[PDB]
Amino acid sequence: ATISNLASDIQSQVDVIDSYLKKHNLQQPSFEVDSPSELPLDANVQRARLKLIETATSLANLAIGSADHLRWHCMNNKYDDMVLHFLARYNIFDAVPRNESISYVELSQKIGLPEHRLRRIMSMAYTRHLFCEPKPGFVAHTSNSALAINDPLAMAWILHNVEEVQPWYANKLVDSTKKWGDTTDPRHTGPNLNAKAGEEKLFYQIMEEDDQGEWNGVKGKGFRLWRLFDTDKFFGTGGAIKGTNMLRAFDWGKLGKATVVDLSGITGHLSSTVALAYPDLTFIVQERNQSWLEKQFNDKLPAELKGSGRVRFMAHDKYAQQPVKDVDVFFMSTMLHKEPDEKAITILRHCAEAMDPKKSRIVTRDIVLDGGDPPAEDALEVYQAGLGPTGVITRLNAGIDLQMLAVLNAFERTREDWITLFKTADPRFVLKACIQTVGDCASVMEWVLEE
Amino acid sequence: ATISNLASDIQSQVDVIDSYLKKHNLQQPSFEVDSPSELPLDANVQRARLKLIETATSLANLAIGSADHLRWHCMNNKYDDMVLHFLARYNIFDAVPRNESISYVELSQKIGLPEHRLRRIMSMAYTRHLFCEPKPGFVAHTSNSALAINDPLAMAWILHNVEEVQPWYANKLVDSTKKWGDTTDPRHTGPNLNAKAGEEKLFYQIMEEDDQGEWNGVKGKGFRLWRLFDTDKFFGTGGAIKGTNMLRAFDWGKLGKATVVDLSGITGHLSSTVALAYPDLTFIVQERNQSWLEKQFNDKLPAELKGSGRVRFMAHDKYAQQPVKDVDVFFMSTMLHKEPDEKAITILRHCAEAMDPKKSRIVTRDIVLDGGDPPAEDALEVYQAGLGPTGVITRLNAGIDLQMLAVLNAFERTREDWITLFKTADPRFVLKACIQTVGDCASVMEWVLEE
Numbered sequence: 001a002t003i004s005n006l007a008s009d010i011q012s013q014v015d016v017i018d019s020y021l022k023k024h025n026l027q028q029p030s031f032e033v034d035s036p037s038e039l040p041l042d043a044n045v046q047r048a049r050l051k052l053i054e055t056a057t058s059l060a061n062l063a064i065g066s067a068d069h070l071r072w073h074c075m076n077n078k079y080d081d082m083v084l085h086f087l088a089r090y091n092i093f094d095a096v097p098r099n100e101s102i103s104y105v106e107l108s109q110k111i112g113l114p115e116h117r118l119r120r121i122m123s124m125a126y127t128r129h130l131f132c133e134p135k136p137g138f139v140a141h142t143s144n145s146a147l148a149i150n151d152p153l154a155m156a157w158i159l160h161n162v163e164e165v166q167p168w169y170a171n172k173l174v175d176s177t178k179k180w181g182d183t184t185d186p187r188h189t190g191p192n193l194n195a196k197a198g199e200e201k202l203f204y205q206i207m208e209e210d211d212q213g214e215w216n217g218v219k220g221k222g223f224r225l226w227r228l229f230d231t232d233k234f235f236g237t238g239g240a241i242k243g244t245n246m247l248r249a250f251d252w253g254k255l256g257k258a259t260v261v262d263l264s265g266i267t268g269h270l271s272s273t274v275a276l277a278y279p280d281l282t283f284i285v286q287e288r289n290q291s292w293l294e295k296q297f298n299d300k301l302p303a304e305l306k307g308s309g310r311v312r313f314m315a316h317d318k319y320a321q322q323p324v325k326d327v328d329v330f331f332m333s334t335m336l337h338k339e340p341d342e343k344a345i346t347i348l349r350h351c352a353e354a355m356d357p358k359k360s361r362i363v364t365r366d367i368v369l370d371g372g373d374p375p376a377e378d379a380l381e382v383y384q385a386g387l388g389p390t391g392v393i394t395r396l397n398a399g400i401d402l403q404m405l406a407v408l409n410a411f412e413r414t415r416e417d418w419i420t421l422f423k424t425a426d427p428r429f430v431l432k433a434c435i436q437t438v439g440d441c442a443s444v445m446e447w448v449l450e451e
Numbered sequence: 452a453t454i455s456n457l458a459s460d461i462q463s464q465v466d467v468i469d470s471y472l473k474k475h476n477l478q479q480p481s482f483e484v485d486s487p488s489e490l491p492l493d494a495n496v497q498r499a500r501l502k503l504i505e506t507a508t509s510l511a512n513l514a515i516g517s518a519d520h521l522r523w524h525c526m527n528n529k530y531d532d533m534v535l536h537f538l539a540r541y542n543i544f545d546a547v548p549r550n551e552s553i554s555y556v557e558l559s560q561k562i563g564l565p566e567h568r569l570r571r572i573m574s575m576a577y578t579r580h581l582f583c584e585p586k587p588g589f590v591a592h593t594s595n596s597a598l599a600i601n602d603p604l605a606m607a608w609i610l611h612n613v614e615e616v617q618p619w620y621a622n623k624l625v626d627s628t629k630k631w632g633d634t635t636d637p638r639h640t641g642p643n644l645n646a647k648a649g650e651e652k653l654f655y656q657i658m659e660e661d662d663q664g665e666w667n668g669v670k671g672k673g674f675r676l677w678r679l680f681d682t683d684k685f686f687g688t689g690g691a692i693k694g695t696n697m698l699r700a701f702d703w704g705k706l707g708k709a710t711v712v713d714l715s716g717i718t719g720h721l722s723s724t725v726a727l728a729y730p731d732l733t734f735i736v737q738e739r740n741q742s743w744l745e746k747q748f749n750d751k752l753p754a755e756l757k758g759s760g761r762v763r764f765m766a767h768d769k770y771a772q773q774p775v776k777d778v779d780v781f782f783m784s785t786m787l788h789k790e791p792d793e794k795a796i797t798i799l800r801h802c803a804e805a806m807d808p809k810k811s812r813i814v815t816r817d818i819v820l821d822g823g824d825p826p827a828e829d830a831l832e833v834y835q836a837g838l839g840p841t842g843v844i845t846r847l848n849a850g851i852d853l854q855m856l857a858v859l860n861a862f863e864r865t866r867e868d869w870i871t872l873f874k875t876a877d878p879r880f881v882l883k884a885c886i887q888t889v890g891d892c893a894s895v896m897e898w899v900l901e902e
């Protein structure tokens with residue numbers, strides 16, 4: 001890399017994107033409040049976008065240079081997360097009006113944060129194009145901040161990472177590695193570094209048991225788990241892993257009228273997306289029960305689906321025998337990646353025992369660390385755009401993989417890992433398709449039992 | 452901003468830098484191990500560099516877009532610091548040979564980190580051009596990683612931030628703000644959220660008292676403070692705030708043979724830099740004593756200065772009367788920024804009482820949040836390059852300011868703040884010069900007592 005070659009590559013990638021936007025009369029992205037929140041899902045546009053992010057980030061890194069690399073990173077980067085901590089806990093996104101400016105004086109008063117401290121936080125936020133200072137003394141939204149107005153799912157993602165993952169798990173991972181070594185046991189995690197025998201706490205135990213708090217409609221026991229469920233929905237409502245990508249990566253219409261057991265769990269929000277598009281499907285969403293789960297599940301269903309039976313909750317232990325009969329599809333989105341081999345095999349064997357090999361299939365959605373195949377229309381540099389050692393999808397896969405490590409001692413898998421896993425569960429399993437849309441990190445994989 | 456206009460601005464800034472490098476037969480930066488670690492200090496080159504970093508970072512942000520902004524940031528960014536935590540605690544910089552590759556198998560064995568976990572950490576490191584994977588199975592250095600080989604000052608900066616500042620202070624700042632409000636009391640910090648009356652601990656108390664550890668030649672009591680001293684020296688040895696910038700921002704030669712009391716403290720490493728360049732100066736470096744400080748101070752002096760008396764340590768309480776007579780300069784680099792007004796005024800009044808107004812001066816070096824003046828040669832867009840709401844020097848100033856907030860409830864100052872402060876200490880104080888070299892965040896300010 002040289003600064004000139006990176007600049008040349010940037011110009012080539014921008015030209016691809018800008019030419020497409022102009023050809024199709026599409027809005028240009030900006031930092032204004034009503035900027036489009038994403039670029040077109042056209043595969044060549046997304047290929048250019050992923051390369052552009054990587055090339056621009058590399059150019060900034062090269063221009064910073066090696067002398068200021070650690071000096072500046074270890075100074076500044078952690079405060080981007082602390083700024084978000086403040087913005088979420090003082091509800092600054094909602095306090096700044098979407099379409100107007102507000103003085104620091106008035107904003108400080110609205111949120112109860114002393115103005116001098118408020119100014120110091122905002123100074124750092126602006127450097128990430130998070131809010132702006134349109135004139136001295138005043139604050140306004142940017143594209144990035146306005147998208148999070150009135151969005152508890154976004155606030156959940158900030159707070160889960162800054163109040164739970166980073167302090168309890170990531171900061172402690174060196175010490176956990178020194179204490180237990182490299183294991184897949186979710187007890188071998190930061191909160192248990194000094195725990196007595198049998199008094200260890202699992203992440204999911206803390207989530208479902210703590211009652212000292214409240215989050216978005218759930219008060220007391222399990223408020224942290226409900227917030228976690230909110231985070232999962234956040235990754236479905238928009239951005240790279242948006243749930244509608246599944247409709248491009250798998251043809252749900254070929255199933256006709258069919259019963260789908262959705263072992264994705266959570267609140268069935270992906271089942272709802274597919275159900276709205278395919279009225280002949282019934283989704284039975286299976287998850288470990290919580291006192292509040294059936295009520296919240298039902299309250300959050302799209303209005304069109306409430307009371308219809310098309311998407312319904314069924315409490316279920318995923319490690320137990322499957323009670324539903326005549327299942328056409330077992331669907332598991334971003335669920336098996338939390339399961340080390342033995343646990344994943346238990347789940348898959350219960351599914352296989354409930355499958356009619358001639359009629360049934362498993363559809364999973366998970367990271368394939370070395371890349372799924374693009375949709376046939378999009379088919380065809382050593383790596384696919386986004387992958388490779390500085391790729392932005394490599395980087396997102398690594399962030400998710402390290403979250404699995406830090407919180408659970410779980411791990412992401414390559415395509416061969418997935419195939420080996422399924423074949424160990426049942427040697428009749430065959431991978432029929434592994435489709436990753438450009439811009440996403442996850443693949444939709446279709447599995448059948450071939451006799 | 453549009454993607455096209457940002458790309459155009461990048462090309463203009465790269466052209467400035469590349470033209471200068473080629474004109475002067477200078478090495479091109481790259482990610483290779485022996486890349487130059489910085490660009491020329493020519494003011495127009497540095498102006499282009501600061502703008503290039505900002506424009507490239509803005510383009511990456513815009514191409515990520517608002518939908519993936521929080522989704523990806525709250526996933527990934529904290530793991531850049533966790534990766535550094537591993538790299539420092541397992542000494543991976545030193546274990547990878549500077550000029551050769553090493554297999555993951557061999558690297559894992561050298562450092563005692565299981566290979567599967569080692570691979571997952573390195574995957575994230577490469578995305579920041581920290582190390583690389585030159586062929587499958589193998590690890591090598593990059594420019595950014597090789598500069599930290601055998602550098603305890605760099606490792607100190609990683610570990611101070613990831614093991615002390617972030618967990619003990621930054622992560623707790625929302626709760627500290629809720630508990631005490633906006634104060635300047637260094638007791639009103641994270642470690643004391645649940646402390647009983649009179650049992651509060653100051654950051655500097657923890658640093659100088661904890662004896663459960665060892666760092667770079669200091670075992671037991673005060674090892675964390677010695678590590679902190681190492682971090683301070685790290686910012687002097689290279690990069691933006693390098694100590695030799697002071698020789699461009701102030702003319703130490705005009706003093707002739709002179710006695711300088713250096714209330715910068717620490718280990719006098721800036722006094723040493725100036726002393727080497729100006730043999731007629733004597734520096735009396737004043738700092739709070741520690742058992743190990745005189746020995747370490749003397750051991751780290753440049754060989755040419757050892758035993759010469761040109762740079763010597765004098766234990767001193769900066770809040771107490773000044774014992775040295777006939778002082779020509781009181782020098783304070785990056786010291787007063789840790790001092791709220793009343794404390795800073797105490798220090799400045801002790802200096803003023805020891806000054807002969809006709810002979811003496813104070814030279815300080817600190818952030819001026821709204822920008823010092825460039826050296827006269829470099830004199831002469833709303834903001835100076837690097838400043839403004841997305842400037843990279845604005846961002847560095849904010850990182851330092853928020854570190855002062857989180858650890859100390861201290862704060863950075865504008866030029867008017869500094870002038871007001873000095874005049875409150877002694878109304879005879881006049882600011883004679885405030886010089887900031889392009890690429891640095893700190894200004895060298897010269898103060899005299901005018902009758």
Ligand SMILES: C/C=C/C[C@H](C)C[C@H](C)C(=O)c1c(O)cc[nH]c1=O
Pocket residue numbers: 228231232235241334337338366367399400403404407442
């Ligand atoms: C394949 C991508 C799935 C999207 C998820 C938001 C990824 C995220 C790391 C996740 O799975 C988490 C989890 O399971 C448990 C706790 N904390 C999490 O963040």
Ligand SMILES: C/C=C/C[C@H](C)C[C@H](C)C(=O)c1c(O)cc[nH]c1=O
Pocket residue numbers: 679682683686692785788789817818850851854855858893
């Ligand atoms: C003006 C710039 C000075 C360079 C310093 C490395 C800045 C840094 C924030 C600092 O002062 C620190 C400190 O005083 C106390 C603890 N932890 C620090 O990091």
